[PDB]
C-alpha cells in the first residue's frame, strides 16, 4: 500500500486504531460554503480539487483549500478508504509540516475531506524548474530547510506510530513561505499513469524509493520510511533527478539493491548530507537512524 497507517508498538503506544472507530462530527463543514475550482490531481478512485471555503474554523476565514472526494469508479471499499484517511487525520492532530485536516462534509451528499491547500505545488517539479531556470536561485539553506521540514513531519508521524509508505519528492508539497508539508496523497495522486509506480501483480509500487525489506518481504515500518527519506534527500540534493539515473527497474535492479548498491553523492550535497543518505540506506533496518536523530543532525548542518 501507499497510504498512511497506524501500527502497534511495544516510546509511543497505540491505544486505539482510529480507522476502526466512528468519525468525529466536530469536523463537519457545510458543503454549500465551498466553491469549487480546478482539479489538482486524481487517482483511480479519488480526486483533489481546489476550492474557496467560506467561514471555515475558529477565525471564520475565507480561504483556498484542497478538497478530496471520490470519482464515479468508487464503490464501498473506496468510500471506506477515504473515511479511514479522514479518521487518521482527525486522530493525529496538527503539525506545521503536515497537510492539516480542516473539515469534512460527510452528510447531504458525497463525502468531502477538506485539507490545507499548498500554493507552490510539489517539491519535485519545484526543484526541476529552479534547476533549469535561464536567469531567486536556490541556496544550500533552502535545501537544508526542505530536508529539515520533511524530517520534522516524519518525526511527528513516527511519534504517533504512523507509517507513511510513499516518501518521495513528488509527495512533498510547498506552501506559503515555500514551507514543506507531507500528507497522505495515495487516493488522489495519479499512480496509474506514472511509470515510477511499477506493476507488481495487482499493485503499483514506487520501487526506486522502497527499502529492500518492503519490496521483497512487504514489511513496512518507521525504518522503511527512513530508507525512502534517504532517497528523497538524494532527489533534493540532485535538484530533482530520477533515482538510480538511467537504470531500469528489472531483475538486475533488485539484485543491485539487495547486494548493497547505493547511488553516488548528488552534485549539491555536502559530504555530511550524503552521510545521512548512506545511514538511511543501511541494509539492516535497526542500523538506520531515527527521524529524531536526522532532525538533530540536520539542525547542526544548518547552524554550522
Ligand atoms: C501539480 O500541481 C500542483 C500540485 C499540488 C498542488 N497543491 C496541493 N495542495 C493540497 C493538496 C494537493 N496539492 N494534493 C495532491 C494533488 C496532486 C499531486 O500530485 C499530489 C498532491 C492533495 O491531495 N492535497 C490535499 C498544487 C496547487 C498544484
Grid cell 472507530 in the structure block, residue: 21
Best residue among 66, 101, 153, 168 to mutate for probing ligand 1, ranked by most atoms within 8 Å of CB: 66
| Residues 139-171 as b or e (16 or more Cβ within 10 Å = b) | eeeebbbbbbbbbbbbbbbbebbbbbbbbbbbb
- Beta bridge mates, 68: 48, 113
Sign of the C-alpha dihedral, residues 220, 266, 204, 74?
A: positive
Same fold, 15-117 and 118-298: no
Please choose, from the candidates 278, 294, 271, the residue with its C-alpha nearest in 3D space to the C-alpha of residue 222: 294
How many other CB atoms are found less than 10 A from the CB of residue 96?
Answer: 13
Can you give the residue ranges of every domain in the chain? 15-117, 118-298
Please choose, from the candidates 174, 163, 88, 184, the residue with its C-alpha nearest in 3D space to the C-alpha of residue 138: 174
Where in the sequence numbering do the catalytic residues fall?
A: 166
Best residue among 173, 178, 189 to mutate for probing ligand 1, ranked by most atoms within 8 Å of CB: 173
Phi-psi region of 245 (alpha: psi -120 to 50; beta: other; left: phi over 0): beta
173 lines ligand 1 (CB under 6 A): yes
3-state secondary structure of 28: strand
Cβ atoms 1, 166 nearer than 8 A: no
118 lines ligand 1 (CB under 6 A): yes
Best residue among 4, 38, 39, 40 to mutate for probing ligand 1, ranked by most atoms within 8 Å of CB: 40
Radius of gyration of the chain (CA): 19
Cβ atoms 115, 183 nearer than 8 A: yes
Residues written for the chain: 304
Alpha carbon of 130 to ligand 1 centroid (Å): 19
Atom of ligand 1 nearest to the CA of 188: 23
174 lines ligand 1 (CB under 6 A): no
**Exposed / middle / buried, residue 236 (Cβ in 10 Å: 0-12, 13-18, 19+):** buried
- Is the CATH code 3.40.50.720 the one for domain 15-117? no
Alpha carbon of 41 to ligand 1 centroid (Å): 6
Q: Which three cell numbers stand for residue 196?
A: 515510477
**CA dist., res. 229 & res. 161, Å (int):** 17
Atom of ligand 1 nearest to the CA of 118: 9
**CA dist., res. 287 & res. 281, Å (int):** 9
- Chain breaks after residues in the chain, where C lies over 2.5 Å from next N: 10, 135
Sign of the C-alpha dihedral, residues 249, 192, 20, 165?
A: positive
122 DSSP 8-state letter: B
CATH classification (class only), 118-298: mainly alpha
Which H or E run includes 87? helix 76-92
Q: Which three cell numbers stand for residue 147?
A: 530536508
Atom of ligand 1 nearest to the CA of 190: 19
Alpha carbon of 80 to ligand 1 centroid (Å): 22
- CA trace torsion 34, 110, 88, 17 (10° rounding): 150
Is 55 assigned to a binding site?
Answer: no
44 DSSP 8-state letter: S
237 lines ligand 1 (CB under 6 A): no
**Exposed / middle / buried, residue 213 (Cβ in 10 Å: 0-12, 13-18, 19+):** middle
- Beta bridge mates, 113: 68, 104
122 lines ligand 1 (CB under 6 A): yes
Backbone angles phi, psi at 122, to 5 degrees: -80, 150
Amino acid at each position: 500500500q501507499v497510504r498512511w497507517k497506524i501500527i502497534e508498538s511495544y516510546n509511543s503506544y497505540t491505544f486505539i486504531d482510529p480507522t476502526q472507530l466512528p468519525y468525529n462530527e466536530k469536523w463537519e463543514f457545510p458543503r454549500n460554503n465551498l466553491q469549487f475550482g480546478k482539479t489538482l490531481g486524481a487517482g483511480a478512485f479519488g480526486k483533489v480539487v481546489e476550492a474557496t471555503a467560506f467561514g471555515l474554523g475558529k477565525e471564520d476565514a475565507v480561504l483556498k483549500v484542497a478538497v478530496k472526494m471520490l470519482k464515479s469508479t468508487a464503490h464501498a471499499d473506496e468510500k471506506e478508504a477515504l473515511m479511514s484517511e479522514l479518521k487518521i487525520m482527525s486522530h493525529l492532530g496538527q503539525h506545521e509540516n503536515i497537510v492539516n485536516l480542516l473539515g469534512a462534509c460527510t452528510h447531504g451528499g458525497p463525502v468531502l475531506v477538506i485539507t490545507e491547500y499548498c500554493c507552490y505545488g510539489d517539491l519535485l517539479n519545484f526543484l526541476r524548474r529552479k534547476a533549469e531556470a535561464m536567469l531567486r536561485p536556490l541556496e544550500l539553506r533552502d535545501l537544508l530547510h526542505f530536508s529539515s521540514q520533511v524530517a520534522q513531519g516524519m518525526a511527528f508521524l513516527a511519534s504517533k506510530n504512523c507509517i507513511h509508505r510513499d516518501v518521495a519528492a513528488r509527495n512533498v508539497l510547498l506552501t506559503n513561505g515555500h514551507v514543506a508539508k507531507i500528507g497522505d496523497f495515495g487516493l488522489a495522486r495519479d499512480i496509474m499513469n506514472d511509470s515510477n509506480y511499477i506493476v507488481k501483480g495487482n499493485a503499483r509500487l514506487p520501487v526506486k524509493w522502497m527499502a529492500p525489506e518492503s519490496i521483497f518481504d512487504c514489511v513496512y515500518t518507521v525504518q522503511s520510511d527512513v530508507w525512502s527519506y534517504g532517497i528523497l534527500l538524494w532527489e533534493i540534493f540532485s535538484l530533482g533527478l530520477n533515482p538510480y539515473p538511467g537504470i531500469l527497474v528489472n531483475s538486475k535492479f533488485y539484485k543491485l539493491v539487495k547486494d548493497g548498491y547505493q547511488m553516488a553523492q548528488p552534485a549539491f550535497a555536502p559530504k555530511n548530507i550524503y552521510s545521512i543518505m548512506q545511514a538511511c540506506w543501511a541494509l539492516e533496518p535497526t542500523h538506520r537512524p531515527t527521524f529524531q536523530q536526522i532532525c538533530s543532525f540536520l539542525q547542526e548542518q544548518a547552524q554550522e
